[PDB]
Structure formats: C-alpha cells, structure tokens
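User: Structure please.
Assistant: Input sequence and predicted structure:
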Amino acid sequence: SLSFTPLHTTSEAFIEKALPWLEDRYFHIAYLNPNGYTAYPQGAFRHYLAFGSEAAIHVSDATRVFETWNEIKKGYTNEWIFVFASYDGKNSVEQLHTSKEAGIAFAAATFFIPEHVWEIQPDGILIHKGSGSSLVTEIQHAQSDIFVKQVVSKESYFNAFDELQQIIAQGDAYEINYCIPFTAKGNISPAATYQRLNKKTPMPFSVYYKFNTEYILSASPERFIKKTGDTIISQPIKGTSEKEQSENTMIVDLVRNDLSRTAVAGSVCVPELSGLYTFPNVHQLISTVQSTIDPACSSIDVIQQAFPMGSMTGAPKVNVMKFIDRIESMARGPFSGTVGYMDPHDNFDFNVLIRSIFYNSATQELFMEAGSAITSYAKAETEYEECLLKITPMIHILN
C-alpha cells in the first residue's frame, strides 16, 4: 500500500508553500503540473513532485546523453528516474555537431533517482516513494526587474529567413523550425517566478525544475512523447488556414517516421488529426500520433530515435538539423529539449521545452527562445512578428 496525506488547503495553496520550502532544502526538484487540463487527449502531465536524490548525474558532453540514460536505467530498474535532455542531445542520436556558443551555462542532460515522489491530488498527497509524510506536515505548517536582450536583429532575422527560403526553393528542405534567442543577466527567485509565469499562462505540460544551480520554469503546452504500457504517443500542436493545415500534416508525417523506427510494423497511426479541445484559458488543435513499441526496442530507444522532436526541427530531419545549426545564432541548449519521468513500470512522459525561462543562479544568466515553422507559405514580416509575440509573455513576467 501507498500512504496518502489529506490536504486542508487547495493543492495550489500547498504547492505555493512547497516549492520555495523545497528550494531552500534540496538541490534536485522536479514539479510537473497539468494545471487542471483534465480533458487533454490521453491526459495532461501526471501531477508529480519529486525531490531529493539517491543518485544524480550531470552530463556536459552532448554526445553522451543516451549512453548515460541507458547506464542509469540499467542500474535502476523498477525505479523512478527524472530526466532533462537538452536539444544538443541530437549529437547523441546522429553524427551532428553544435557549432555555436550556448546562451546559458547548462547541462547537456541531467538524471536523478528521487528520494521522494509525490502525486498531488485535489484533496491530498499520494506518496509513491520515500517516507515523507512528516515533510508534507512541515510544509503545511511552514526582486529587481530584468531587461531582456534580443540577440537576433530584424535585419539578421530576414537574412536567415532568406537563407532558409533559398534552401527550400532549391529543394533541399520543405519545412524548418527557425528559432531566435533572448538573453538576460540578473537574479531571480525561481519558484516565485514560476508561480507568476504559471498563473499568467497555465498550460498542460508546465514544469518547475531545479538541478544544482540550473532551473527550468516552463509553461509548455506540448507533449513530446509518452509510453503507457506498450503504447507510444506523440502530440504535435497547431484554424482552417491552408498554411496551418499543410504545415501540421508535414510535421505529423515526420513524427510518424520517428515512431516507426521503434514500432511494431503496421502499428503507426494517427488516431486524431487536429482535434479541437476547449480548456478554460485556451482552445487548442492537437494531433495524436501513436505506435506500439517493438519488443526488441527499449523505452530509451523509442525516445532516442524520436529525439529531438519533429515539431521543432523539420524535413528532411538530419539535413535540416545541420541547416538549423549553421543558420541559428546560438546553440539551443535547453530550449527545445525535454523534461519528464520514467516510472517503475517502464512508463514515461516527456514535454517540449518551449514557452520556458532557463536560469542559472551561479552565472546569473537567463535564456529563452521562440520560433516558428518556415515553409514556402511563410512571409518574413509575419514570422518575425510571431517570434516576438511568442516570447513577449516570458519577458513580461520577468518585469
């Protein structure tokens, strides 16, 4: 049996106390917050709060992300593993390099076997791991503005956009997700900043994460990949605009390839293409791509072959990842990476790290990016404006 502690406040009120309290006491914290998106297709994130560790690994070499993941999984079978993998983990999937400097000092990937794993429910805390009842009880009874620098000027954006359109016009690609970075220097209170971000823009795959001095404050609306028994799903998001419909199909079809590499033959399908879902703060169109795991492939193989996300790269994927690395101004680092968990039953769930603020308290660095899908239907003025609008919420919360 598991132990359950009844709450005498809302779960929101508990977590408003819990995150800062834990911030002050632990160096490894992962909080996955579905924000009451109860109607999300296949479910939103599990509402997990995991903290402390019996084992933790910080990877700096981006070619060793999946090697390390495999090693720790072998050592900790039938155990909880909380994972961050940077976009540069691409260099562990294909023969690729990252040619530019990153915008923040940050791991290529991190892994921890948590000491405590709680599932937050509306009426209480379900304890999956650890004997932390007394900590729930302890928690129960327990700032300058920052200017954000636009790294890529409008002139530079248009030059890059034109370069990408020429690649497309030559027939060397048909879709490229082009992103631009924003940086700042300063001090923030991360849990407090997460609370401001999350209250303003609550999303189904939100995360607060701390590893040493590295923090991820995410308002991600997007699932990268999930495993439930033998069933794998990935859910690109994208409105009867012909441009959008065409883009969505290009991406869904790329994700089918990625799942196909570790799937039972004939099992890759699309149960829902652009399904309309209505939530309190937003309506969303969501596509669900599904496969059945090939018994000869491990859960890590599934993720590796699908990484980084199709929705954040393009087609053809390998060459487009090369074009991205050449044409973007900085390494993406944690942007377009993933945070998630593997559980003792070999189920897993992982998000897409967009709509996020990345912070390192040791270096006083802040980093964020935004991007959009570039195709033959894109116009520079419009996509530039879209990038700026997409980042504006994050800049707003920091001020």
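The domain at 1-399 is CATH 3.60.120.10 (Anthranilate synthase).
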